[PDB]
Every structure is written in structure tokens, then in C-alpha cells.
Design a protein around this ligand. Structure first.
Ligand SMILES: Nc1ncnc2c1ncn2[C@@H]1O[C@H](COP(=O)(O)OP(=O)(O)O)[C@@H](O)[C@H]1O
Ligand SMILES: [Mg+2]
Ligand SMILES: [Mg+2]
Length: 296
């Protein structure tokens, strides 16, 4: 799905007649939504597809129920859209978190005290998040990893049936079986996780040199807390293993080798993710990357 500035203003006016829009510009794109900065202070998200609308609905709900529970600012829900045939949530408007992404580059050019404070503040944020009680959240917010693996396996076997040689598809089937047979991916204490926890969602106040917010809870779910560390670990694009180690220890994690193992698994698994989502949407260049990584 695609939007003009006019369509965006029209959707909003339709449910918020008195809200007069003075300025509008595009703040960012993501995997699910286009984000619009409206009147300087609000960020509106419009969904590009069915799945993104579904995630936007869950974002709104999760953000409302963890409002004011966390030690870092997070977006607050101010405006809400509505259902549309195939879209659960037509748009949502949030408070804008001030600041700039704490990029790997930015982090490494900070002095060591601030670097270390940052690791501490991230650890504390994740410790609080992972400590929120999950008894009240519905079934759909829980992630069944076994179900995900098994459904991905079937999607891979259909999609690649004519791309891969027999022995290669055998190796793919082996890879999945090994994941399923290894209990380390399923035997965890589930909690609320961010599930997209990376440097571009970590906003930074470069005047105080401290982290001043966390954004994008679109993927937030009940799942494995180790995933919030793994997503920061990739050498380029994200932070080093050295810096996440600092976070893990502030967090008081007792099994960093397991986090490392899980990371290594997700690193291989990403190629299949690219194949599935490369087809499932429209980018045949994400499809071709994954396929090339498998054949490598
Ligand atoms: N509440 C917010 N405060 C400040 N900036 C935001 C906010 N929401 C979104 N943005 C900007 O819009 C971009 C896309 O938002 P995001 O929620 O990450 O999209 P997606 O859910 O599609 O991944 C972000 O990278 C950020 O630059
Ligand atoms: Mg994002
Ligand atoms: Mg998202």
C-alpha cells in the first residue's frame, strides 16, 4: 500500500476533525510502516500491508499497557485509527521521542564513561522490560518458536523446490531438524521483549550524552529475552560483542555462551528469512541474497 500527504491528512481529519495539521513531513520508513512527523511533536504510522497493520495494532496495545513502567521514555499513544477490511489498525499517532539514533559510530566516538553509562542504561531498560508481569497478556502476543520454525520450513521447501539440488535441500532440512532438536531455543523463561532492539531504535541526547529513549515496539512480543541482546550483536550495522557483553553483565546474565550460540543460529537463519519475506512481499533482491547465501 502507498500514501500521499493528502490521503494521510484525510484519514486523520476523518477521525480527528478538530486536530488542525500545520506541518507534515515523512520521518522515516520501516519494514511495516511509513512514519509521518506532524506538527513537529507527533509521529503518525501508516501501514504498508496487512501484517504491518496487525503489528501496529499490537504496538498500540503494548505501548498503552507498558506506559510509564519503563526507565526510558517510549512513545505514548495519542491518536488511533480503525479497522479497514484487511487492516486491523488504519494508523496510529504517537508522541515523538527527541534525539538521534545511537549508531555504532556515534557510540564509539563517545568517551568511555558515557559508553559505559550507555551500556548500563540499556541493561536497566531491558531488565525492567523483561520483568514486567506477563499474566495479563493474551495468547496471540506469545511467540511459539517451534510453530515459526515448522511453518518456515514448509515455506522454504515449497519456495526453493526448484532452486536447490537434492543434497542442498537435505542440508536445509537437516538445519531445521537440528534447531528443533536442540532444547536451548525453547527452554527459556518467556517475558515481554522488544523484539526489534537495535541501534536505530535507541535514541540519544548528544547534549547530555545519555540515552533518551526507545522506539518501535511494532514487533514487541512475549518471547525469549536473549533475543533483545542478539539483535545488538552484529559487528557492522550493530554494536560489537564487546559492548553487548558490557550490557549482559550489567543485566547480570548468567549464561553468555547460550546467547552467543543463539546469535550464531539466528545469523544462519536470516538467509531463510530473506527468502520467505523476499517472496512474501516484493523484493526479489532479498530473495536472491538469501538464495546466494544458502548456496555459498
Ligand atoms: N515515536 C517516535 N519518536 C521519534 N521518532 C520516531 C517515532 N516513531 C518513529 N520514528 C521514526 O520513524 C522511523 C520508523 O519508525 P519505526 O517504528 O521504527 O518503523 P517500523 O515499525 O516500520 O520498523 C524510525 O526509525 C524513526 O526515525
Ligand atoms: Mg523501525
Ligand atoms: Mg517495527
Amino acid at each position: 500500500r502507498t500514501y500521499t500527504f493528502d490521503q494521510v491528512e484525510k484519514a486523520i481529519e476523518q477521525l480527528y476533525p478538530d486536530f488542525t495539521i500545520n506541518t507534515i513531513q515523512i520521518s522515516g520508513k520501516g519494514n511495516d510502516c511509513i512514519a509521518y512527523e506532524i506538527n513537529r511533536d507527533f509521529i503518525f504510522k501508516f501501514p504498508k500491508h496487512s501484517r504491518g497493520s496487525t503489528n501496529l495494532f499490537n504496538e498500540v496495545n503494548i505501548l498503552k499497557r507498558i506506559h510509564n513502567k519503563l526507565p526510558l521514555p517510549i512513545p505514548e499513544v495519542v491518536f488511533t485509527g480503525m479497522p479497514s477490511e484487511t487492516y486491523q489498525m488504519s494508523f496510529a499517532g504517537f508522541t515523538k521521542i527527541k534525539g538521534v539514533p545511537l549508531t555504532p559510530l556515534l557510540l564509539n566516538n563517545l568517551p568511555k564513561q558515557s559508553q559505559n553509562q550507555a551500556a548500563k542504561d540499556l541493561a536497566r531498560f531491558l531488565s525492567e522490560l523483561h520483568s514486567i508481569n506477563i499474566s495479563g497478556f493474551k495468547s496471540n502476543l506469545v511467540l511459539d518458536f517451534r510453530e515459526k520454525i515448522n511453518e518456515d520450513n514448509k515455506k522454504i521447501k515449497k519456495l526453493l523446490s526448484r532452486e536447490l539440488k537434492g543434497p542442498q535441500m537435505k542440508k536445509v532440512d537437516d538445519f531445521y531438524r537440528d534447531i528443533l532438536e536442540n532444547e536451548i531455543y525453547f527452554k527459556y523463561y518467556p517475558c515481554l521483549i522488544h523484539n526489534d532492539f537495535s541501534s536505530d531504535h535507541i535514541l540519544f541526547d548528544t547534549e547530555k550524552n545519555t540515552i533518551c529513549g526507545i522506539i518501535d515496539f511494532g514487533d514487541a512480543a512475549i518471547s525469549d529475552p536473549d533475543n533483545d541482546f542478539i539483535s545488538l550483536m552484529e559487528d557492522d550495522e550493530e554494536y560489537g560483542m564487546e559492548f553487548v557483553s558490557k550490557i549482559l553483565n550489567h543485566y547480570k546474565h548468567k549464561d553468555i555462551p547460550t546467547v552467543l550460540e543463539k546469535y550464531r543460529m539466528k545469523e544462519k537463519y536470516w538467509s531463510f528469512e530473506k527468502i520467505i519475506y523476499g517472496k512474501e512481499y516484493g523484493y526479489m533482491d532479498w530473495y536472491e541474497e538469501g538464495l546466494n547465501e544458502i548456496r555459498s
